[PDB]
Amino acid sequence: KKVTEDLSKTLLMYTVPAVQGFFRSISLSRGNNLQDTLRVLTLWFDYGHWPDVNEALVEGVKAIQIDTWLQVIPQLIARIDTPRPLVGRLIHQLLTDIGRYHPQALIYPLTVASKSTTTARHNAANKILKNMCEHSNTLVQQAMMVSEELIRVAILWHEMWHEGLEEASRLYFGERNVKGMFEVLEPLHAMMERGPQTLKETSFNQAYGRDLMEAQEWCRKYMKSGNVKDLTQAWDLYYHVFRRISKQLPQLTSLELQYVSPKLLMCRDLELAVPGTYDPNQPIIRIQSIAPSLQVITSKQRPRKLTLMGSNGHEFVFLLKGHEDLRQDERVMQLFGLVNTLLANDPTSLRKNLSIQRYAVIPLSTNSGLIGWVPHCDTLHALIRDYREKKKILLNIEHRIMLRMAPDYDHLTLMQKVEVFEHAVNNTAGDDLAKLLWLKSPSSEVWFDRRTNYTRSLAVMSMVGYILGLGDRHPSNLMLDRLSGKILHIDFGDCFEVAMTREKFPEKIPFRLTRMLTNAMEVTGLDGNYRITCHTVMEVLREHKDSVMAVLEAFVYDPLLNWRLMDTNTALNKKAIQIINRVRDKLTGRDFSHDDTLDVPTQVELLIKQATSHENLCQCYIGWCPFW
Amino acid sequence: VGSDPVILATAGYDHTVRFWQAHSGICTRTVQHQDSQVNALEVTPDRSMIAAAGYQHIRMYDLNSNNPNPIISYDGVNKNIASVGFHEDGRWMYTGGEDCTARIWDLRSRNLQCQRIFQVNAPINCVCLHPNQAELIVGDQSGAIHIWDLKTDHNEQLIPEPEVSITSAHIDPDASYMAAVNSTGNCYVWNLTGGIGDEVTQLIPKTKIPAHTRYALQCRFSPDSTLLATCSADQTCKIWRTSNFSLMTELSIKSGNPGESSRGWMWGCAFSGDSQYIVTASSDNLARLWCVETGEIKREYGGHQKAVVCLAFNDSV
Amino acid sequence: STINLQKAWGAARRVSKDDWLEWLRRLSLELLKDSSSPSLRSCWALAQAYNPMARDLFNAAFVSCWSELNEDQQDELIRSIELALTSQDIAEVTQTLLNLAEFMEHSDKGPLPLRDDNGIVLLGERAAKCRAYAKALHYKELEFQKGPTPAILESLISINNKLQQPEAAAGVLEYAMKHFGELEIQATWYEKLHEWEDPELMLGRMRCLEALGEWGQLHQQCCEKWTLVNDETQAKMARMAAAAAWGLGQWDSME
């Protein structure tokens, strides 16, 4: 170890003025300092358990403004423990500096900190909660108490135990018995019997529960017996109550909030600022009251529409959902703070108003949280349907022209797939979108402005999408603002190149550009306004790599994001570094070929051609609307 | 059926294999592929038998029996089998198919498994005849002209125009010239050059052919080797003098009106008589029989339920 | 029945701005009084008492009578209306009828005909000369749908500058190199473009040379060309020639 240690401590002599000039620059500036904030916290989490690294860090930690750490509350609640001895021990205290000055910011993250499955986090949480309780006038006790109502209602027990039951038949079958009946079905009924048989309206929740119970008896008999009669009894009884549930999940819509939970609705005018919307630079806007009934969106996931009165008279609208922890999304929206700040530095970027539309993300479990309900927005998918349906054009004509030319489409050769795709495309107009945007808009003078803002906001996320690797761009995963014409984006489940990896219909695309969008842009096509907006953004990125690469490297290497990445893709640190290596190919023009440095114009031209291959397009799945 | 000295063999996208006594103007028998899209059809030049190939499958049948079922079957290349031929004596089948593993298969005895394998990084996009029957011409999704010895992997892997999958190739019947075809719309012709050492062929460049706007599909010689045809997604078959591989005459279905462009993406050509006739896989509902050099349309056959995928032919022993 | 259309058919003898504005208002009053809607038939009283809100009700009143015209009554009224624009460019009624046409374009009546061809060019010209550059741009986009010409591009490009969009004008030139090929007409127009950008040979360069300020070569050019030429060509270049002399400190030459 001595060779790498001597190197690491001669490196630490370099780290000393690195850290010092970082801290004094972090004193001298705001915003951009976050690159430095990340890097010092990084080298600390990397190597801080040596006392000689602790020397460089601790004096600067103890001689820099609190506001520094308000930049990293989520990035620092991520690994709230950071378990290595003097590292975690000092970070516990450092988080209780925010847990002295600014509890209204920290308290949602401290709610998150409560309910780790593994021990480590839960312990740092209980320490830091009760360190903060006195420093914060027992605000913690009010806020955790309130949040505990919301956490329980959040994936309201009924839809969960229904879905677990429907899943359980699709688990026990064949010979893998435990996965369905044993594991789901008794814990399910136990978690009706405590939970919604008490902290929801007992009897009517028990309206399903009382037939789920008689199937549960036969299930409990089978669990221990192994008598194959108990199995078929348990299943047939479950099929009967499942069939009752099967008719009612389709037609619940709006739900009285105390019947959603009798403690919910009833809290008022709190010691809490509105859910992570607020910040301590402003006078408080406080949770005052709640919408009387919360509303299941008519979708496969069944999220709840909500709104909260703030003490300032505003209403703040949220969508309550969960099948993954929103932190991953939060960190994607956090990076957009930086990219917006880059475009705000350059005079021509600034003059042309360029930015990404970030939106509010508030995680509350491994599954769930609140998402900000954006106003004024419709999916790109819905609008095409509206236009076609209102005109009484046959909705999905293009797939039908393909099948009528050849029903064999999906197993044709390369060039035959292309030929039939070209034929169905050439037999169909490709500009419904251009028409509906004009029709919808009031008058030409507004419409021209809208077309411009549409074009530019599309161009911006053409570049950041391509840098990130982002895919799954079917038009039900795109959204449009009906006042400005700005585009908006709504899923990031697979950010990196792995969209190209998907085995059946690989998303063989750098970013989505397509005939209805291009035909909705100017009659000139993309050269001029679009192409030049692409150049300016890529120049600004080609330049400020130290900022963007720091945020990327920090996020992408992260030992806890590595479990999100084992859910996304795939130590993984190597694949993470390979992604950063490929980003550094995109830096130069080595992305097209590993030998080459290319100018921005040449890089963009090759990128456009990659985004217009007929072959790639008719290797998206037909449900991706590659005809549009 | 099989006794006729001139037989037309075909499929539509409907993939049913349609066999015409060529003089007749009727599909005299039909073999009902409705499992998998046809990817090649391969009647023996001896007029006796056919290997019929499609997605995941090849099967072996006679020409003289009415609507036959598989006498031998071939399976496991669970991909598009874009080209099929033989060890020319009829001992083995050869297949270019879009698994990473092209194959030699038994026609000496009943076997479903391949007699041998050729393995490549990128899956296999085309094949052609090679006269020694100690190598095979192979082409693929790496764009590499894998002329390949049948056991050693002594191989050519040449790429004349950069990177792209080579869509087809063919040899001179007298094996002095070889033409290689690409998705970029082009063909490149290289002089066949010989080595007894190792077990592998050599190529030297001859002619550069930017033949079409649209993607170049297939080429074939007249039986006298005097002409080489080349044909495309572009709706026309251009005929070259073998001497310098430049234009004699052209037979075209380039549409009378652009209201119906792709009257057909003609999927290549074959010949009949002593270079009297040229035939095309015309990608219209017609399989199309024409005269060479005169360039003129003689008989056309509409029996396919969907438009033509492939043309296979006999006017030979 | 037809008194409505007769009050537009006075278009044979409306001459002054007030004649056509009086025609528009008294027409509106007859459209209201014989409208398909009982509501509007009362609103006719207010419209008489107070014209500014009649400007509004007119658009509805128009649909309310225009649905009750068959092809003859349509053609009859169409002519009196296309004659309102055709007679004169009068900005008031021009902008008003442009909004009325645009209102029809959003309507499911379709666009009104005006001298065939959905009025596209008449509307375009009228809009352009009314400084309403976005509406003019919309009609020029619409002509480009009915097939391109070099004259369309050399119209369109000025509209993009009249609306302050340099990158859009750059797009049209880029289009004109790839759609139209190296079309030798536009390939000449690289020296008809306002920027230097790599007597039309003499002054149709000196404009560019004194914009750039290639002061040495510009001084030689101005000295040479001014001493050579003898017409309004001397007068039109004398800016660049005094400017060159100034740039060179030649106070004697400058006069």
PDB file of C-alpha atoms in Angstrom, chain B residues 90-189:
ATOM      1  CA  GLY B  90     -25.551 -31.257 -54.713  1.00  0.00           C
ATOM      2  CA  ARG B  91     -23.546 -32.822 -51.783  1.00  0.00           C
ATOM      3  CA  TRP B  92     -24.284 -29.940 -49.305  1.00  0.00           C
ATOM      4  CA  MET B  93     -26.402 -26.798 -48.925  1.00  0.00           C
ATOM      5  CA  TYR B  94     -24.777 -23.398 -48.160  1.00  0.00           C
ATOM      6  CA  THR B  95     -26.633 -20.563 -46.290  1.00  0.00           C
ATOM      7  CA  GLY B  96     -26.005 -16.836 -45.722  1.00  0.00           C
ATOM      8  CA  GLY B  97     -28.236 -15.970 -42.737  1.00  0.00           C
ATOM      9  CA  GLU B  98     -28.473 -13.249 -40.120  1.00  0.00           C
ATOM     10  CA  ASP B  99     -27.237 -15.219 -37.138  1.00  0.00           C
ATOM     11  CA  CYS B 100     -23.486 -14.739 -36.234  1.00  0.00           C
ATOM     12  CA  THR B 101     -23.085 -18.331 -37.717  1.00  0.00           C
ATOM     13  CA  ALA B 102     -23.471 -19.105 -41.470  1.00  0.00           C
ATOM     14  CA  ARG B 103     -23.659 -22.837 -42.270  1.00  0.00           C
ATOM     15  CA  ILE B 104     -23.050 -25.836 -44.538  1.00  0.00           C
ATOM     16  CA  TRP B 105     -25.882 -28.434 -44.302  1.00  0.00           C
ATOM     17  CA  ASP B 106     -26.328 -32.088 -45.315  1.00  0.00           C
ATOM     18  CA  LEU B 107     -27.703 -33.049 -48.792  1.00  0.00           C
ATOM     19  CA  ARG B 108     -25.805 -36.441 -48.885  1.00  0.00           C
ATOM     20  CA  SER B 109     -27.932 -37.779 -45.928  1.00  0.00           C
ATOM     21  CA  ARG B 110     -30.914 -36.899 -43.600  1.00  0.00           C
ATOM     22  CA  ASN B 111     -29.671 -34.382 -40.922  1.00  0.00           C
ATOM     23  CA  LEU B 112     -31.389 -31.187 -39.448  1.00  0.00           C
ATOM     24  CA  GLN B 113     -28.089 -29.907 -37.843  1.00  0.00           C
ATOM     25  CA  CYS B 114     -25.460 -28.243 -40.079  1.00  0.00           C
ATOM     26  CA  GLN B 115     -22.582 -30.322 -41.537  1.00  0.00           C
ATOM     27  CA  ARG B 116     -20.287 -27.313 -40.502  1.00  0.00           C
ATOM     28  CA  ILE B 117     -20.305 -23.615 -39.265  1.00  0.00           C
ATOM     29  CA  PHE B 118     -18.680 -20.294 -40.325  1.00  0.00           C
ATOM     30  CA  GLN B 119     -18.658 -17.817 -37.344  1.00  0.00           C
ATOM     31  CA  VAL B 120     -18.357 -13.957 -37.557  1.00  0.00           C
ATOM     32  CA  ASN B 121     -18.736 -10.932 -35.138  1.00  0.00           C
ATOM     33  CA  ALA B 122     -21.522  -9.351 -37.362  1.00  0.00           C
ATOM     34  CA  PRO B 123     -24.323 -11.662 -38.721  1.00  0.00           C
ATOM     35  CA  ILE B 124     -24.431 -12.802 -42.379  1.00  0.00           C
ATOM     36  CA  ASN B 125     -26.190 -10.748 -45.137  1.00  0.00           C
ATOM     37  CA  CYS B 126     -25.361 -12.674 -48.426  1.00  0.00           C
ATOM     38  CA  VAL B 127     -23.522 -15.650 -50.175  1.00  0.00           C
ATOM     39  CA  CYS B 128     -22.310 -16.700 -53.692  1.00  0.00           C
ATOM     40  CA  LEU B 129     -20.949 -19.749 -55.698  1.00  0.00           C
ATOM     41  CA  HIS B 130     -17.131 -20.461 -55.624  1.00  0.00           C
ATOM     42  CA  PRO B 131     -15.780 -23.030 -58.172  1.00  0.00           C
ATOM     43  CA  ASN B 132     -13.296 -25.134 -56.078  1.00  0.00           C
ATOM     44  CA  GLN B 133     -15.947 -26.110 -53.387  1.00  0.00           C
ATOM     45  CA  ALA B 134     -13.058 -25.660 -50.828  1.00  0.00           C
ATOM     46  CA  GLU B 135     -14.262 -22.044 -50.110  1.00  0.00           C
ATOM     47  CA  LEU B 136     -17.578 -20.078 -50.114  1.00  0.00           C
ATOM     48  CA  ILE B 137     -18.204 -16.334 -50.902  1.00  0.00           C
ATOM     49  CA  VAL B 138     -19.867 -14.801 -47.750  1.00  0.00           C
ATOM     50  CA  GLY B 139     -21.000 -11.173 -47.034  1.00  0.00           C
ATOM     51  CA  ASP B 140     -22.294  -9.643 -43.840  1.00  0.00           C
ATOM     52  CA  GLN B 141     -23.328  -6.786 -41.498  1.00  0.00           C
ATOM     53  CA  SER B 142     -19.592  -5.805 -41.036  1.00  0.00           C
ATOM     54  CA  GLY B 143     -19.567  -5.135 -44.855  1.00  0.00           C
ATOM     55  CA  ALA B 144     -16.714  -7.719 -45.171  1.00  0.00           C
ATOM     56  CA  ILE B 145     -16.341  -9.831 -48.396  1.00  0.00           C
ATOM     57  CA  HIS B 146     -15.636 -13.051 -46.382  1.00  0.00           C
ATOM     58  CA  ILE B 147     -14.544 -15.393 -49.173  1.00  0.00           C
ATOM     59  CA  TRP B 148     -13.971 -18.224 -46.653  1.00  0.00           C
ATOM     60  CA  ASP B 149     -12.231 -21.659 -46.797  1.00  0.00           C
ATOM     61  CA  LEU B 150     -14.791 -24.287 -45.576  1.00  0.00           C
ATOM     62  CA  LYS B 151     -12.749 -25.435 -42.417  1.00  0.00           C
ATOM     63  CA  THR B 152      -9.678 -23.196 -41.563  1.00  0.00           C
ATOM     64  CA  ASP B 153     -11.088 -19.584 -41.524  1.00  0.00           C
ATOM     65  CA  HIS B 154      -8.538 -18.653 -44.284  1.00  0.00           C
ATOM     66  CA  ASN B 155     -10.678 -15.628 -45.370  1.00  0.00           C
ATOM     67  CA  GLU B 156     -10.686 -12.394 -47.523  1.00  0.00           C
ATOM     68  CA  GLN B 157     -13.010  -9.957 -45.462  1.00  0.00           C
ATOM     69  CA  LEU B 158     -12.283  -7.114 -48.052  1.00  0.00           C
ATOM     70  CA  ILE B 159     -14.281  -3.748 -47.916  1.00  0.00           C
ATOM     71  CA  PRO B 160     -14.048  -1.677 -51.205  1.00  0.00           C
ATOM     72  CA  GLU B 161     -16.524   1.188 -50.232  1.00  0.00           C
ATOM     73  CA  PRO B 162     -16.396   1.917 -46.438  1.00  0.00           C
ATOM     74  CA  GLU B 163     -18.164   0.224 -43.406  1.00  0.00           C
ATOM     75  CA  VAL B 164     -21.693  -0.730 -44.705  1.00  0.00           C
ATOM     76  CA  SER B 165     -23.266  -4.242 -44.971  1.00  0.00           C
ATOM     77  CA  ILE B 166     -22.654  -5.732 -48.452  1.00  0.00           C
ATOM     78  CA  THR B 167     -26.161  -6.558 -49.786  1.00  0.00           C
ATOM     79  CA  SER B 168     -25.003  -9.155 -52.418  1.00  0.00           C
ATOM     80  CA  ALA B 169     -22.126 -10.405 -54.593  1.00  0.00           C
ATOM     81  CA  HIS B 170     -21.564 -12.705 -57.598  1.00  0.00           C
ATOM     82  CA  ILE B 171     -18.728 -14.619 -59.324  1.00  0.00           C
ATOM     83  CA  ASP B 172     -18.053 -14.892 -63.111  1.00  0.00           C
ATOM     84  CA  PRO B 173     -19.178 -18.434 -64.213  1.00  0.00           C
ATOM     85  CA  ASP B 174     -15.556 -18.792 -65.560  1.00  0.00           C
ATOM     86  CA  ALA B 175     -14.300 -17.234 -62.230  1.00  0.00           C
ATOM     87  CA  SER B 176     -12.117 -14.390 -63.682  1.00  0.00           C
ATOM     88  CA  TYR B 177     -14.355 -11.463 -62.357  1.00  0.00           C
ATOM     89  CA  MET B 178     -16.235 -10.871 -59.035  1.00  0.00           C
ATOM     90  CA  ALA B 179     -18.814  -8.106 -58.309  1.00  0.00           C
ATOM     91  CA  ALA B 180     -19.686  -6.878 -54.762  1.00  0.00           C
ATOM     92  CA  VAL B 181     -22.860  -4.855 -53.991  1.00  0.00           C
ATOM     93  CA  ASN B 182     -23.860  -2.416 -51.173  1.00  0.00           C
ATOM     94  CA  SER B 183     -26.670  -0.460 -49.406  1.00  0.00           C
ATOM     95  CA  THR B 184     -24.871   2.807 -50.383  1.00  0.00           C
ATOM     96  CA  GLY B 185     -26.368   2.232 -53.900  1.00  0.00           C
ATOM     97  CA  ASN B 186     -23.247   0.917 -55.575  1.00  0.00           C
ATOM     98  CA  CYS B 187     -21.227  -2.035 -56.854  1.00  0.00           C
ATOM     99  CA  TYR B 188     -17.439  -2.600 -57.113  1.00  0.00           C
ATOM    100  CA  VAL B 189     -15.949  -5.247 -59.449  1.00  0.00           C
TER     101      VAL B 189
END
